[PDB]
UniProtKB/Swiss-Prot annotation:
The chain holds residues 349 to 458 of 1362 of the full protein. It comes from Homo sapiens (Human). The record marks N85 as: Acetylated histone binding. Chromatin reader protein that recognizes and binds acetylated histones and plays a key role in transmission of epigenetic memory across cell divisions and transcription regulation. Remains associated with acetylated chromatin throughout the entire cell cycle and provides epigenetic memory for postmitotic G1 gene transcription by preserving acetylated chromatin status and maintaining high-order chromatin structure. During interphase, plays a key role in regulating the transcription of signal-inducible genes by associating with the P-TEFb complex and recruiting it to promoters. The NET domain mediates interaction with a number of chromatin proteins involved in transcription regulation (NSD3, JMJD6, CHD4, GLTSCR1 and ATAD5). It is found in: Nucleus; Chromosome. Interacts with p53/TP53; the interaction is direct. Interacts (via CTD region) with CDK9 and CCNT1, acting as an associated component of P-TEFb complex. Interacts with RELA (when acetylated at 'Lys-310'). Interacts (via NET domain) with NSD3, CHD4, BICRA and ATAD5. The interaction with BICRA bridges BRD4 to the GBAF complex. Interacts (via NET domain) with JMJD6 (via JmjC and N-terminal domains); the interaction is stronger in presence of ssRNA and recruits JMJD6 on distal enhancers. Interacts with NSD3. Interacts with NIPBL. (Microbial infection) Interacts with bovine papillomavirus type 1 regulatory protein E2. This interactions may serve for the tethering of viral genomes to host mitotic chromosomes allowing successful partitioning of the viral genome during cell division. This is Bromodomain-containing protein 4.
């Protein structure tokens, strides 16, 4: 069961990285580069930063003990985005589009 669900989770992340979703997924590929982006207050507001590459590394290092732990990291990524940015921000619109993809696949896990 657990190995099966983590297998599915790897398939979900792979979909999220796929060219099909690149136009709204790209901001989540890597850790937020606060210095490059000039986000002086990002670490004041966001205590547990998360991104798709860190999630990929954690999967491949077999650091998730079940699918819900993986699920909580993905949702943390998205929540950090919603916490930091105003609701009308361009990056929030992208986050919700990508969360469409995640939530639909995640719910249909065996
Ligand atoms: C993820 C995530 N969470 N927040 C943010 N990203 C993020 C992470 C990585 C990369 C981009 C972003 C974008 C973003 C994404 C898409 C469009 C616009 C902004 N916006 C970032 N937020 C912000 O205020 O950037 C200022 C800004 C605004 C405009 C330009 C430069 C800097």
């Amino acid at each position: 069961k657990v190995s099966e669900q983590l297998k599915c989770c790897s398939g979900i992340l792979k979909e999220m990285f796929a060219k099909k979703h690149a136009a709204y997924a790209w901001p989540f590929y890597k850790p937020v580069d606060v210095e490059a982006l000039g986000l002086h207050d990002y670490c004041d507001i966001i205590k547990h930063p998360m991104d798709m590459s860190t999630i990929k590394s954690k999967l491949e290092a077999r650091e998730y003990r079940d699918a819900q732990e993986f699920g909580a990291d993905v949702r943390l990524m998205f929540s950090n985005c919603y916490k930091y940015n105003p609701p009308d921000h361009e990056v929030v619109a992208m986050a919700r589009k990508l969360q469409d993809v995640f939530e639909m696949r995640f719910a249909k896990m065996p």
